[PDB]
Amino acid sequence: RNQPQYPARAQALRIEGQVKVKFDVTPDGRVDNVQILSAKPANMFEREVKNAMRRWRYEPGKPGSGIVVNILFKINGT
């Protein structure tokens, strides 16, 4: 389970937000049915997450539909 890359624009304006993803699992480890529930702030991390849930991979043959993650992007602080 890899981690989503911090969006440039954000990585630049020292800003942050959280993202609620809901998705499925294709019978082989991969993923499918990519969806974005809530994501404050708006257009900023979306695409960044979708692209990160691309190389994901775990248990082949034991899929499941409808599973939420919810990920938050953060900046050092100092």
Partner: protein, 702 residues
């Protein structure tokens, strides 16, 4: 249910995309990945992000908010990306443009252009540059980096529909073919159709930019960059007399902005195809090698009938057709000549560099050493018409295969250009100070065959050009500096002796400060300079049809730009330009300012995005571009007026509806449909500015 969490630690590329609209690192001023502040000379970087916000139909309309650059030399025509940087241009309505670090050498009419949709970033480097690129106009040079492959997927198709029957369809796809992300690719293409602001003239373009990238390890890259663009029609490119544009006509009315002194069957085609690679290899913390190559064949066909000013013009004094009408008429009657032309040209160019970073005392070094080779050839088969070349016109087709030896002649020329140069540059930084020092020797051989005369004049040049500068690095950002830069460009014209003139020279001193913080993505830059071209050819005092060297022009002034991501909802771009240009040593125009270069230029634009509440996603932009008055000819006879136009933006982010990225927006150029004249290069060569132009677009980043 579960949860994940992310972190920081930055780094942008000079050849990659910029984090925001405020580029932080360029490389087209030192040929090294370098933060803008550390560059001893003036620079500018129009980001793709920025461009794809005005939806410019060309790189010229993309430089509208850039200082020391008039994008109105030909007004509303986009046949060429012809720029005048700091009152200077190449010679012979030729352009000084580079792509991915290599010059796109043109000639006569054969000049190629790259659509901006294929560009990743458009940089402008003002001031002399022979120190790094060889021959060129003093103060002036356009370098555009092409979009390159990207690690993450990219699937985007774009639809543009606008005024004057504009229809565009483009697509930009890029991705990684393997798991370990080594073999990547990118395919960019588009098809555009539209009527030229004028009448009877349309413009269609189809271009595909295929690019491949190989990265065996992490200290090596190899990117194939090809580009093929075909245009069956390039649009209007004629001339209108001030007698009907700047100044009114005898009847009192002026010609409409969509007028066209051309013939229903004028045609202008241009086909360009090019292929090359950008190689880069890091051997270790000290040695790194690069290499940019490229070869390209381009063609340009044309059957045009332009308009030489009205009949009462000093230009038409020896005109029969004109001079045979009641003097009352002469004022509202336009002369006209024509041109038929088939051109083809090839251009090869490689540049092997060797970057070497090393120590010494407390000073670090970034030493560059390279060999630049360039060769080009353009074969011309043109035919021209004079004075009584074509029927008059008050204020219809045209037999182009007429070729009447009574008022028409042949122009069959074969030009050869070649240039090898060597150079070294040291970017020395002593803790707080940065001294950039470099030099380059160039061997510029040229040869011209006058097929319709057996006449063949040629020449070889040996020129040394160097540069020096200093940058003080206040650890808060702000960077003050000053630099001395040299330039030189050979002449293609012949003298009374029968030999091509000596290369003209360009010297320039500049002083300024650049603010490039760390906290925010901002880039404020101001500068004051004094640029002077010497040995500029001027007329023969002993009354002759030949010109004479030993002239001089001066460009002096200041310019300030600022681009920045103020908040996360505010973006602001702006500048001011002050150009004082004047003939210092001229045989007939002393004390006069060169035509088309304005004294004052200003630009300001900002957009605001809504993130909360109903309007969440909406983005609203607006801006303005001011252009000062200018002289319409060397004689500084009449003057073209000053104009201010406004642009506007409305863009909704479809992410509020399941589609992040993808949006739909309205772009408006020249909101109040101002009716203006961009400029005139002479009493008889004027150009109308673009009329209001609306473009509605749909971007889908699937």
């Amino acid at each position: 249910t579960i949860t994940v969490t992310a972190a920081p630690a930055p780094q942008e590329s000079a050849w990659g995309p910029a984090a925001t609209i405020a580029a932080r690192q360029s490389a087209t001023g030192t040929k090294t990945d370098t933060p803008i502040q550390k560059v001893p000379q003036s620079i500018s970087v129009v980001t793709a992000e920025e461009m794809a916000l005005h939806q410019p139909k060309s790189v010229k309309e993309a430089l509208s908010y850039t200082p020391g650059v008039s994008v109105g030399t030909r007004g509303a025509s986009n046949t060429y990306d012809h720029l005048i940087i700091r009152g200077f241009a190449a010679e012979g309505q030729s352009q000084n443009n580079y792509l991915n670090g290599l010059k796109l050498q043109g000639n006569f009419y054969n000049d190629a252009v790259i659509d901006p949709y294929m560009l990743e970033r458009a940089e402008i480097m003002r001031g002399p540059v022979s120190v790094l690129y060889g021959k060129s106009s003093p103060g002036g040079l356009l370098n555009m980096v092409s979009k390159r492959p990207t690690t993450e997927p990219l699937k985007e198709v774009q639809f543009k529909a606008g005024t004057d029957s504009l229809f565009q369809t483009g697509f930009d796809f890029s991705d990684s073919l393997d798991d370990d992300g080594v073999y990547s690719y990118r395919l960019t293409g588009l098809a555009r159709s539209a009527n030229a602001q004028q009448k009877g003239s349309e413009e269609q373009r189809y271009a595909i930019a295929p690019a491949f990238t190989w990265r065996p390890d992490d200290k090596t890259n190899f990117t194939f960059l090809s580009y093929f663009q075909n245009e069956p029609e390039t649009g209007y490119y004629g001339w209108l007399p001030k007698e009907g544009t700047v100044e009114p006509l005898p009847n009192g009315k002026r010609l409409p902005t969509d007028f066209n002194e051309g013939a229903k069957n004028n045609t202008y085609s241009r086909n360009e195809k090019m292929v090359g690679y950008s190689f880069d290899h890091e051997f270790n913390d000290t040695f790194t090698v690069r290499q940019n190559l490229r070869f390209a064949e381009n063609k340009t066909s044309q059957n045009s009938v332009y308009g030489y000013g009205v009949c009462s013009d000093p230009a038409n004094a020896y005109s029969k057709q004109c001079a045979a009408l009641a003097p009352a008429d002469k004022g509202h009657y336009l002369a006209r000549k024509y041109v038929v032309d088939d051109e083809k040209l090839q251009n090869f160019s490689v540049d092997t560099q060797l970057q070497s970073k090393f120590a010494t005392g407390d000073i670090d070094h970034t030493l560059l050493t390279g060999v630049d080779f360039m060769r080009m050839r353009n074969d011309i088969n043109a035919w021209f018409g004079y004075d009584d070349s074509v029927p008059l016109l008050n204020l219809t087709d045209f037999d182009f295969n007429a070729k009447d030896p009574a008022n028409s002649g042949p122009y069959r020329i074969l030009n050869k250009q070649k240039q090898t140069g060597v150079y070294v540059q040291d970017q020395a930084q002593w803790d707080k100070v940065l001294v950039t020092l470099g030099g380059r020797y160039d061997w510029a051989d040229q040869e011209s065959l006058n097929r319709v005369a057996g006449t063949t004049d040629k020449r070889d040049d040996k020129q040394f050009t160097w540069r020096g500068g200093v940058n003080y690095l206040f650890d808060n950002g702000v960077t003050p500096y000053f630099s001395y830069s040299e330039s030189f460009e050979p002449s293609s014209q012949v003298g009374k002796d029968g030999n091509i003139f000596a290369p003209s020279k360009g010297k320039q001193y500049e002083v300024g400060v650049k603010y490039v913080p760390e906290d925010r993505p901002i880039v404020v830059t101001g500068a004051v300079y004094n640029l002077t071209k010497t040995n500029n050819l001027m007329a023969d005092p002993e009354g002759s049809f030949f010109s004479v060297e030993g002239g001089e022009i001066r460009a002096r002034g200041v310019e300030i730009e600022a681009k920045a991501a103020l908040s996360a909802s505010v973006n602001v771009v702006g500048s001011y330009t002050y150009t004082d240009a004047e003939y210092t040593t001229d045989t007939t125009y002393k004390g006069n300012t060169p035509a088309q270069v304005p004294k004052h230029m200003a630009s300001l634009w900002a957009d605001y995005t809504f993130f909360d509440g109903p309007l969440s996603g909406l983005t609203l932009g607006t801006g303005g571009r001011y252009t000062g008055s200018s002289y319409g000819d060397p004689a500084n006879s009449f003057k073209v007026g000053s104009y201010t136009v406004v642009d506007a933006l409305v863009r909704y982010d479809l992410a509020r509806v399941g589609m992040a990225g993808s949006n739909v927006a309205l772009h408006v150029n020249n909101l109040f449909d101002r009716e203006y004249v961009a400029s005139c290069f002479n009493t008889y060569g004027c150009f109308w500015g673009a009329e209001r132009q609306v473009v509605a677009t749909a971007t889908f980043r699937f």
